[PDB]
Amino acid sequence: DGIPYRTVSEWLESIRMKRYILHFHSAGLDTMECVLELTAEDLTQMGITLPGHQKRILCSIQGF
Numbered sequence: 001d002g003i004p005y006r007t008v009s010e011w012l013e014s015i016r017m018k019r020y021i022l023h024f025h026s027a028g029l030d031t032m033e034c035v036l037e038l039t040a041e042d043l044t045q046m047g048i049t050l051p052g053h054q055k056r057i058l059c060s061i062q063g064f
Contacts, residue, residue, distance in 0.1 A: 003032045003064050011035075015060045020048055035061060 005011035011032060012018040023046045029035055038061060043054050 003036075005032055008032060008035065011060075015056055017053060017056060020046075020053075023047055036064075 005014060008024050008030065009018065009021060012021055024030070027046050038058065040054050040058065043049070043057060048054060048057070
């Protein structure tokens with residue numbers, strides 16, 4: 001598996017981005033497996049638009 005978090009929630013808590021939990025559920029991103037291919041364009045369309053926040057989420061994913 002190799003993903004260091006069990007749930008999108010626990011993952012988001014870890015990077016202090018749990019404010020965006022509802023955004024992930026809205027986009028039907030409910031398991032960790034779903035988040036692996038996110039780009040900045042996908043985050044934008046999720047309504048996660050701030051660069052800093054994108055960087056935070058995307059680096060975390062590369063870091064898995």
